[PDB]
């Protein structure tokens, strides 16, 4: 039936890795994997250091014992520290016994991941996000959420892809991979920064239309087809990402399952962009959803 | 900022309780708490028994050894079985060492909970749901999801409120509390059953409008107020639940935080119902959201 939900990965393998990192009066979250704790390097900042911190200079004045690391109620001993890009790596004398099989991945714009929102090292909530084309995410983060991570789970392996650092003025979020490199052009200082144009992830909207068809929501199917070049003219007007032949190939499984050629679905999407949804819903949404990948759709449609 | 997401509870405390229950050729999920496994009683049904099962008669032919219970790759020994309403309770010789502090609660229509969707005893995904006024939920469930549970977490205590049993023809879902009593008038047989009218949870839409204001999405605030009786005339036309003085009292914290009297917000809601959203969004939604309780809003707005 028409039941289709934004589903997050079960969070238990990540919950066991969240710790609290305190330096002076600043507390945020860290990720404890093996004998290393990862956290945003601005744990070392006071509120008169945020406008333009010199992180190398601020770190000169910090020693192992200035980093307080707490896993639940239990204190970790810090035996080494280093800065890698915008993350701090705290070497502790105890390997996390709850460390899962894991990898660090730098995800591509358009890919989705689960966020485990944490405050003071304690898990608060889990939700699904996408890396947007402008390298922001539409999260739900407050003061104290920094160091919360984004991940995907493939069988038993956790692929960590995001660490939370900041909120931009449109209310969207920016952060790093687990090597401390920002997604997008953002820097970890409190200066005027703005997200570029928020373009729609075309291949995901198409995947979600396939999901609607598989789930029996079929009203938007029309009698038309189109070409990649003509569809892509329409993509540009409505700030959709161009569709490529790689995107068409990636939609192959969904196309094969439904028997609907990708260019036929593109012609259905073209009409939805030009005419709107006339106050109808698709899988219970009144807007075109772009935060389900082709892989997410196949997963939620086939178990 | 305007970031507000359907957030689920972290699932780790529930993941450790999911097992697989097999009886003959039927496999579904069970919940392993202390030395008891809970699962839907139709684990004992074959596909020629679903139209009108006599569960008491079907259970006569079942012994402890006919219930296969697997936690991961590890077989549990069944030393007793009983039927309680629409659930089976399998006594096993091993207390689940991962059993969390927990309670069984029968939730009220309008209350929200997290679902951990499971297939073959393995967690697949987590998402937030509401018990709708017609005692259905708008889930994402396939074949094999039966026995998946709904829960809330308050600190360290897990309150189990839902076990999944069935899908109705509108694509919505029905199930039981953990004592095996259905929410609503549904029965565990494959017969013509239909959800009643799907009314909107008025107090939740109001809570979500307070969230929009707290998050700076303010365009829908107007210069008007109304009365409970006049608002409630409008509630009826649009299939909204009547608003009561208890609902007004429950919205007290959000009213106090924003300084917006509940009847002023009701007058804003009245105009949104009568005039629609004119293709605008509130917290990124093109429809009025009713699956955030006042408590959910306060939680996501205050950490
Ligand atoms: C995060 O939790 C952190 N909080 C602190 C802190 F209190 C002291 C020292 C270091 C850190 S990191 C927090 C999460 C934000 C808060 C609101 N919603 C969030 O997601 N991150 C920040 O406060 C972050 C840190 C400085 C300023 N930050 C911002 O997010 C600001 N944004 C920007 O300046 C902009 F993005 F450029 F617009 C802010 C506070 C939202 C205006 C730094 C970037 C180091
Ligand atoms: C659930 O996973 C179960 N599957 C089996 C099974 F394969 C064999 C024996 C027992 C069970 S319980 C499954 C979940 C459903 C499937 C589709 N989406 C879901 O959420 N539940 C059922 O198949 C359920 C069991 C019989 C028929 N069921 C229904 O959900 C049917 N619905 C109804 O008859 C209606 F609700 F009344 F409309 C169905 C299959 C969707 C048409 C019973 C109620 C015992």
Q: Say yes or no: A216 contacts chain B, CB-CB below 8 A.
A: yes
Token look-up 């485990």 returns A116
A85 is written with which tokens?
């890009």
Chain A residues with CB-CB distance to B11 below 8 A: 10-12, 126
Q: Catalytic site residue A301?
A: no
Give the helix/strand (H/E) hosting B59.
Answer: helix B55-60
The coordinates were experimentally obtained by X-ray
Per-residue buried b or exposed e for B162-179, using 16+ beta carbons within 10 Å of the residue's own CB: bbbbbbbeebbbbbbbbe
Give the number of other CB atoms < 10 A from CB of residue A183: 24
Query: Which ligand 2 atom is nearest residue B165's CA?
Result: 21
Residues A234 and A214 in one domain: yes
> Is the CB of A145 within 6 Å of ligand 1?
yes
| Nearest Cα residue in chain B from A9 | B125
From the candidates A39, A45, A146, A266, which is the catalytic residue? A146
Would you call A127 and B13 a contact, using CB atoms and an 8 Å cutoff? Answer: no
Phi, psi of B49 (to 5 degrees): -115, -5
DSSP B185: S
d(CA A10, CA A15): 10
Phi, psi of B301 (to 5 degrees): -90, -25
From the candidates A17, A42, A129, A165, which is the catalytic residue? A42
In a domain, B187, yes or no: no
> Is the CB of B236 within 6 Å of ligand 2?
no
Contact A21, A43 (CB under 8 A): yes
Short-list A283, A299, A302, CA closest to A7: A299
- Residue A175's alpha-carbon distances to A52, A164, A186, A301, B200, in angstroms, are 17, 5, 8, 31, 37
Residues B208 and B297 in one domain: yes
Contact A128, A145 (CB under 8 A): no
d(CA A210, CA A256): 10
CATH of the domain at A279: 1.10.1840.10
Q: Catalytic site residue A146?
A: yes
From the CA of A9, how many Å to the nearest CA of chain B? 5
Residues B209 and B281 in one domain: yes
Residues A88 and A107 in one domain: no
Query: Which ligand 1 atom is nearest residue A169's CA?
Result: 38
Domain finish residue from A63, A92, A121: A92
Residues B221 and B291 in one domain: yes
Would you call A1 and B171 a contact, using CB atoms and an 8 Å cutoff? Answer: yes
Token look-up 């969070």 returns A11
Q: What SS3 class is residue B278?
A: coil
In a domain, A1, yes or no: no
Chain B residues with CB-CB distance to A169 below 8 A: 1
d(CA B160, CA B150): 6
Q: What is the resolution of this structure in A?
A: 1.5
Give the number of other CB atoms < 10 A from CB of residue B202: 24
Indicate the residue of A125, A141, A299 with minimum beta-carbon distance to B9: A125
A169 is written with which tokens?
């003025």
Short-list A74, A161, A117, CA closest to B3: A117
Residues A161 and A143 in one domain: yes
Which candidate in A7, A73, A114, A126 is best for mutational testing of the B interface (most B CBs within 10 A)? A126
d(CA A19, CA A69): 7
d(CA A96, CA A28): 18
d(CA B237, CA B10): 38
**Could you tell me which residues are beta bridge partners of residue A84?**
A87
In a domain, B193, yes or no: no
d(CA A248, CA A188): 37
| CB neighbour list of residue B265: distance below 8 Å, 6 or more residues apart | B206, B209, B210, B251, B255
Short-list A111, A152, A114, A110, CA closest to A8: A114
Query: Which ligand 2 atom is nearest residue B146's CA?
Result: 2
**DSSP for B205-273, written as a single string:** HHHHHHHHHHTT--TT--S----HHHHHHHHHHTTBPPP-HHHHHHTHHHHHHHT--HHHHHHHHHHHH
Would you call B10 and A126 a contact, using CB atoms and an 8 Å cutoff? Answer: yes
Token look-up 């026995």 returns B147
A154 is written with which tokens?
């493939």
Phi, psi of A301 (to 5 degrees): -90, -25
d(CA A226, CA A211): 21
d(CA B131, CA B214): 25
Number of compact structural domains in chain B? 3
Contact A205, A288 (CB under 8 A): yes
Residues A293 and A239 in one domain: yes
d(CA B162, CA B245): 28
> Chain B, 173-202: which have a CB under 8 Å from a chain A CB?
173
Residues B30 and B67 in one domain: yes
- Residue B302's alpha-carbon distances to A235, B96, B253, in angstroms, are 39, 34, 12
A24 alpha carbon, closest ligand? 1
Nearest CA to ligand 1 atom 10: A42
Q: Say yes or no: B172 contacts chain A, CB-CB below 8 A.
A: yes
- Residue B222's alpha-carbon distances to B237, B238, B288, in angstroms, are 21, 20, 17
Phi, psi of B178 (to 5 degrees): -85, 0
Residues A235 and A161 in one domain: no
In a domain, A185, yes or no: no
Q: What SS3 class is residue B2?
A: coil
Nearest CA to ligand 1 atom 24: A166
DSSP B61: T
Ligand 2 centroid–CA B65 distance in Å is 25
Contact B174, B164 (CB under 8 A): no
d(CA A165, CA A86): 9
Token look-up 């920094």 returns A146
| CB neighbour list of residue A38: distance below 8 Å, 6 or more residues apart | A30, A31, A87, A88, A89, A147, A163, A178
Indicate the residue of A5, A10, A119 with minimum beta-carbon distance to B123: A10
Q: Say yes or no: B102 contacts chain A, CB-CB below 8 A.
A: no
Residues A153 and A209 in one domain: no
Per-residue buried b or exposed e for B115-125, using 16+ beta carbons within 10 Å of the residue's own CB: bbbbbebebbb
Domain finish residue from B43, B63, B92: B92
Number of C-alpha atoms within 13 angstroms, CB side, residue B68? Answer: 13
In a domain, A190, yes or no: no
Short-list B196, B175, B169, B165, CA closest to B107: B175
The residue segments making up the domain with residue A118 are 102-176
Contact A288, A204 (CB under 8 A): no
Q: Say yes or no: B298 contacts chain A, CB-CB below 8 A.
A: no
- Residue A85's alpha-carbon distances to A175, A294, B39, B285, B298, in angstroms, are 12, 32, 50, 36, 36
In a domain, B80, yes or no: yes
Residues A209 and A295 in one domain: yes
B261: left (phi over 0), alpha (psi -120 to 50) or beta: beta
Chain B residues with CB-CB distance to A2 below 8 A: 170-171
Would you call B215 and A13 a contact, using CB atoms and an 8 Å cutoff? Answer: no
- Residue A200's alpha-carbon distances to A132, A194, A206, A241, B63, in angstroms, are 8, 18, 11, 6, 56
Domain finish residue from B114, B142, B176: B176
Ligand 2 centroid–CA B166 distance in Å is 4
Q: Is A274 exposed, middle or buried (CB count within 10 Å of its CB: 0-12, 13-18, 19+)?
A: exposed
d(CA A147, CA A32): 11
CATH of the domain at B57: 2.40.10.10
**Could you tell me which residues are beta bridge partners of residue A83?**
A88
Q: What SS3 class is residue B179?
A: coil
d(CA A269, CA A265): 6
Q: Say yes or no: A142 contacts chain B, CB-CB below 8 A.
A: yes
Would you call B6 and A142 a contact, using CB atoms and an 8 Å cutoff? Answer: no
- Strand-pair category, B157-167 with B102-104: parallel
Contact A206, B40 (CB under 8 A): no
Contact B177, B106 (CB under 8 A): yes
Q: Which long-range contacts does A257-265 make (Cβ < 8 Å, 24+ apart)?
A: A257/A210, A257/A214, A257/A301, A258/A210, A258/A213, A258/A214, A260/A210, A260/A213, A260/A221, A261/A225, A262/A206, A263/A225, A263/A226, A263/A227, A263/A228, A263/A231, A264/A224, A264/A225, A265/A206, A265/A209, A265/A210
In a domain, B21, yes or no: yes
Number of C-alpha atoms within 13 angstroms, CB side, residue B150? Answer: 28
Token look-up 């198409």 returns A206
Short-list B241, B243, B221, CA closest to B230: B243
Q: Which long-range contacts does A188-194 make (Cβ < 8 Å, 24+ apart)?
A: A188/A40, A188/A41, A188/A42, A188/A53, A188/A55, A188/A86, A189/A50, A189/A51, A189/A52, A189/A53, A190/A50, A190/A51, A191/A51, A191/A52, A193/A166, A193/A168, A194/A168, A194/A169, A194/A170
In a domain, B1, yes or no: no
Q: Say yes or no: B151 contacts chain A, CB-CB below 8 A.
A: no
Short-list A145, A134, A143, A241, CA closest to A194: A134
| Nearest Cα residue in chain A from B168 | A1
d(CA B208, CA B171): 25
> Is the CB of A42 within 6 Å of ligand 1?
yes
**DSSP for chain A, written as a single string:** -------BPP-HHHHTTEEEEEETTEEEEEEEETTEEEEEGGGG--TTSSSS--HHHHHHT--GGG-EEEETTEEEPEEEEEEETTEEEEEESS--TTPPSEEE--PPTT-EEEEEEEETTEEEEEEEEE--TTS-B-----TT-TT-EEEEEETTEEEEEEEEEEE-TTS-EEEE-TTSPBSSS--SSSS--------B-HHHHHHHHHHHHHTT--TT--S----HHHHHHHHHHTTBPPP-HHHHHHTHHHHHHHT--HHHHHHHHHHHHHH--TT--BTTBSS------HHHHHHHHH-
Q: Say yes or no: A167 contacts chain B, CB-CB below 8 A.
A: yes
Short-list B149, B148, B147, B187, CA closest to B168: B187
Residues A122 and A46 in one domain: no
């Amino acid at each position: 039936g028409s039941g289709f939900r934004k589903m997050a990965f079960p969070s238990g393998k990540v919950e066991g890795c969240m710790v609290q990192v305190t330096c002076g009066t600043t507390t945020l979250n860290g990720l404890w994997l093996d004998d290393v704790v990862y956290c945003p390097r601005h744990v070392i900042c006071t509120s008169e250091d945020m406008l333009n911190p010199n992180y190398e200079d601020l770190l000169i004045r910090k020693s192992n014992h200035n980093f307080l690391v707490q896993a639940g109620n239990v204190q970790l001993r810090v035996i080494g520290h280093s800065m890698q890009n915008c993350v701090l790596k705290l070497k502790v004398d105890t390997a996390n016994p709850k460390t899962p099989k894991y990898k660090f991945v730098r995800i591509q714009p358009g890919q989705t991941f689960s966020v485990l929102a944490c405050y003071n090292g304690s898990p608060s909530g889990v939700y699904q996000c996408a890396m947007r084309p402008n390298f922001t995410i539409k999260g739900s983060f407050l003061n104290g959420s920094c160091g919360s991570v984004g991940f995907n789970i493939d069988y038993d392996c956790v692929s960590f892809c995001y660490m939370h650092h900041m909120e931009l003025p449109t209310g969207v979020h920016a952060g790093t991979d687990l090597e401390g490199n920002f997604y997008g052009p953002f820097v970890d200082r409190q200066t005027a920064q703005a997200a570029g144009t928020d373009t729609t992830i075309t291949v995901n909207v198409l995947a979600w239309l396939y999901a609607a068809v598989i789930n029996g929501d079929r009203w938007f199917l029309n009698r038309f087809t189109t070409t990649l070049n003509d569809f892509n003219l329409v993509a540009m007007k409505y700030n959709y990402e161009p569709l490529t032949q790689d995107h068409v190939d990636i939609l192959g499984p969904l196309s094969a399952q439904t028997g609907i050629a990708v260019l036929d679905m593109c012609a259905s999407l073209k009409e939805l962009l030009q005419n709107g949804m006339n106050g109808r819903t698709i899988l219970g949404s009144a807007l075109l959803e772009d935060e389900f990948t082709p892989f997410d759709v196949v997963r939620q449609c086939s178990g």
